[PDB]
Amino acid sequence: DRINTVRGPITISEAGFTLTHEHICGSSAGFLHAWPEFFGSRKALVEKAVRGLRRARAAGVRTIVDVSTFDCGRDVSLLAEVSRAADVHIVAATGLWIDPPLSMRLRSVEELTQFFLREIQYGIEDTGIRAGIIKVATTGKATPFQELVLRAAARASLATGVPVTTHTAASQRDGEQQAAIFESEGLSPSRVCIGHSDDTDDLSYLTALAARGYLIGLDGIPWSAINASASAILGNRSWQTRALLIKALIDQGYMKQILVSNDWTFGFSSYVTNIMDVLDRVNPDGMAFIPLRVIPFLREKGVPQETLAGITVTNPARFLSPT
Amino acid sequence: RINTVRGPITISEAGFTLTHEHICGSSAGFLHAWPEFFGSRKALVEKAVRGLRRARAAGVRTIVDVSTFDCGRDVSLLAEVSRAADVHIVAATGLWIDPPLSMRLRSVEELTQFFLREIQYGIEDTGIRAGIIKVATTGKATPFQELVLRAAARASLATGVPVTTHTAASQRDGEQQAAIFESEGLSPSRVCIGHSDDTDDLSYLTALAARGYLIGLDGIPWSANASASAILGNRSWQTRALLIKALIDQGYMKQILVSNDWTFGFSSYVTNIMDVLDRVNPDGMAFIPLRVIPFLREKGVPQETLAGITVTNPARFLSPT
Numbered sequence: 001d002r003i004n005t006v007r008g009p010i011t012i013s014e015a016g017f018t019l020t021h022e023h024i025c026g027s028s029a030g031f032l033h034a035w036p037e038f039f040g041s042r043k044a045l046v047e048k049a050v051r052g053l054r055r056a057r058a059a060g061v062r063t064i065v066d067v068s069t070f071d072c073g074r075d076v077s078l079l080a081e082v083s084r085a086a087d088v089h090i091v092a093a094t095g096l097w098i099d100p101p102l103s104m105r106l107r108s109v110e111e112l113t114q115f116f117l118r119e120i121q122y123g124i125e126d127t128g129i130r131a132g133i134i135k136v137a138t139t140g141k142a143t144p145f146q147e148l149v150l151r152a153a154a155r156a157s158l159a160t161g162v163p164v165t166t167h168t169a170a171s172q173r174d175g176e177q178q179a180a181i182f183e184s185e186g187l188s189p190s191r192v193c194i195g196h197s198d199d200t201d202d203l204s205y206l207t208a209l210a211a212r213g214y215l216i217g218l219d220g221i222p223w224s225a226i227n228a229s230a231s232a233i234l235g236n237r238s239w240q241t242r243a244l245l246i247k248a249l250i251d252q253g254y255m256k257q258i259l260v261s262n263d264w265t266f267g268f269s270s271y272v273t274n275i276m277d278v279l280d281r282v283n284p285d286g287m288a289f290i291p292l293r294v295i296p297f298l299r300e301k302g303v304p305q306e307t308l309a310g311i312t313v314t315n316p317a318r319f320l321s322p323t
Numbered sequence: 324r325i326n327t328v329r330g331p332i333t334i335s336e337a338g339f340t341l342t343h344e345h346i347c348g349s350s351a352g353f354l355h356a357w358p359e360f361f362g363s364r365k366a367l368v369e370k371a372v373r374g375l376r377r378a379r380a381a382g383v384r385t386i387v388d389v390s391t392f393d394c395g396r397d398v399s400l401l402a403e404v405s406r407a408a409d410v411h412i413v414a415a416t417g418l419w420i421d422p423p424l425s426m427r428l429r430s431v432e433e434l435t436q437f438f439l440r441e442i443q444y445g446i447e448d449t450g451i452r453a454g455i456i457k458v459a460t461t462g463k464a465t466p467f468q469e470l471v472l473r474a475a476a477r478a479s480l481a482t483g484v485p486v487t488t489h490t491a492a493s494q495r496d497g498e499q500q501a502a503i504f505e506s507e508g509l510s511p512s513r514v515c516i517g518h519s520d521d522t523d524d525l526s527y528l529t530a531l532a533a534r535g536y537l538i539g540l541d542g543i544p545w546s547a548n549a550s551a552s553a554i555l556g557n558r559s560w561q562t563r564a565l566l567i568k569a570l571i572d573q574g575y576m577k578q579i580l581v582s583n584d585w586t587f588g589f590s591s592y593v594t595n596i597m598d599v600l601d602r603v604n605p606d607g608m609a610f611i612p613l614r615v616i617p618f619l620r621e622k623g624v625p626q627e628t629l630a631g632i633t634v635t636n637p638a639r640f641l642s643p644t
């Protein structure tokens with residue numbers, strides 16, 4: 001009874017192979033509840049999510065961390081249903097993403113701290129489900145509100161021991177501004193993951209954050225566009241280029257600071273209409289891309305099996321553990 | 324028949340109707356995720372029930388809650404308060420000033436499907452159908468706001484359900500809204516140009532009323548630090564109320580819709596705004612029948628005209644045609 005999941009508290013050993021940055025549905029607050037037909041139906045979305053996590057479990061995955069926040073349309077009741085049906089542990093998230101509504105964006109740091117603490121200590125909505133991770137975001141230079149979210153995330157993390165994970169515009173080196181704000185609040189670097197870090201080839205930026213104790217979120221491995229709307233989100237860099245960054249950080253002695261994931265989803269309303277149809281053709285493996293296509297690739301390049309097992313099992317366990 | 328949060332009602336059951344009100348001004352999913360922001364869900368229900376009972380004792384029989392999906396409309400809350408207070412509440416579809424990513428990236432065809440499902444099928448999984456479409460512009464319409472107005476027009480034309488708007492009246496938004504609605508084939512009699520009491524430009528108001536539009540003089544009690552005087556304004560309630568008399572004197576009594584634009588919870592603004600609002604207007608939703616109606620009677624407006632504005636006009640507006 002260490003890590004909080006959508007099914008209740010589980011132990012460190014029960015976690016196993018863990019994908020640290022995933023989504024069941026990328027949406028907006030109240031959207032799935034108000035317009036389920038957008039995704040065909042709520043039943044069609046549940047079935048697509050259950051089939052996907054079952055194929056991921058058959059490939060080796062035992063736990064996924066759903067980093068969808070309130071404004072990313074997190075519906076913990078959906079997460080609970082798909083978790084139970086697929087028999088895969090799902091860790092829920094609190095925090096705020098890139099689309100906070102007026103009722104969230106006009107709040108103070110004290111109020112946001114109360115909201116984050118409520119979702120971790122009491123529960124999310126009326127479900128009783130407690131969050132086991134805090135997700136925050138910046139897209140370049142932090143807005144005055146985003147600074148308050150990062151400070152509230154840090155204050156909520158120090159009071160509960162629950163980790164913090166971030167969304168970044170990696171090419172603009174956001175991890176450094178996020179890191180500076182977290183440390184100004186007294187938050188330990190070992191409790192933070194700088195996500196979307198595989199969107200850049202700047203190894204100097206990655207190794208420096210890793211040297212301070214930060215976990216590097218190399219979470220968008222299958223995202224490649226090799227269509228203006230699809231190119232702007234997937235990027236023009238291959239999956240191999242993103243995957244070689246895992247090898248590059250191991251070679252420099254930072255195997256303990258790596259967190260790998262797919263940043264996959266089954267429903268996607270916070271982008272263009274038929275993006276889910278384009279995404280499932282680029283990567284038909286889905287969340288099963290890390291154990292099926294990325295792990296045997298790194299084995300062919302010379303990376304040992306024990307260090308890859310240390311990145312997928314030991315690192316997320318230490319990260320998700322309340323300390 | 325008009326759809327309410329408790330089901331369909333006849334034109335006669337509507338009675339004295341306030342056409343632009345809110346039980347709670349919030350954001351989508353907010354009340355469900357953070358009810359303690361309002362003290363508790365129970366505290367918000369209790370405040371709303373007492374406020375609606377005060378409105379009922381003053382003569383109000385129906386309120387039109389113009390809160391949209393993005394304004395945090397919770398029809399289950401509206402249903403609970405309507406039952407306890409014995410006041411009919413008409414719910415709304417449409418989009419307000421804060422659409423999230425999943426809404427702002429949608430096409431006109433997709434938004435039309437959404438507005439239609441809330442009117443024809445129901446809101447969420449509640450079975451409660453919307454009886455009005457709420458839209459918004461804050462100055463010149465953004466490309467997205469133009470799509471919302473067109474989708475609102477298409478939803479209205481397929482159902483007969485009316486359209487009510489939010490405007491930046493000082494910038495004369497009603498003229499552009501009118502042009503967009505008319506380009507879609509929407510009859511002016513199915514549209515209310517709201518927040519029209521935010522301007523003293525009578526020429527702009529009469530020009531729209533002459534074309535057949537309903538003029539929403541909906542923020543009568545809104546009068547005044549920085550955050551307070553920003554939305555409230557420097558003009559008195561009497562100046563806002565005299566716009567009702569000014570339009571009757573020009574022969575447009577049938578084109579007037581009056582309301583308070585009140586709320587019992589407000590999270591989509593600064594923290595203790597509710598404490599500021601409750602002292603500016605202690606009457607709440609009872610402001611229109613308790614203060615505005617006797618004021619207009621003192622100025623020479625007949626009771627038959629006032630009953631025409633508060634009972635006849637809203638009934639004709641809400642009735643699907």
Ligand SMILES: CCOP(=O)(O)OCC
Pocket residue numbers: 023026167220263264265
């Ligand atoms: C996946 C949907 O959310 P996101 O990770 O912010 O999108 C960019 C990868």
Ligand SMILES: CCOP(=O)(O)OCC
Pocket residue numbers: 345347348349489542545554584586
């Ligand atoms: C919640 C009410 O929002 P609004 O009617 O746009 O503004 C009221 C002054």
Ligand SMILES: [Co+2]
Pocket residue numbers: 167168196
């Ligand atoms: Co992200």
Ligand SMILES: [Co+2]
Pocket residue numbers: 021022023067263
């Ligand atoms: Co993500």
Ligand SMILES: [Co+2]
Pocket residue numbers: 489490518
């Ligand atoms: Co308005």
Ligand SMILES: [Co+2]
Pocket residue numbers: 343344345389584
């Ligand atoms: Co309003």
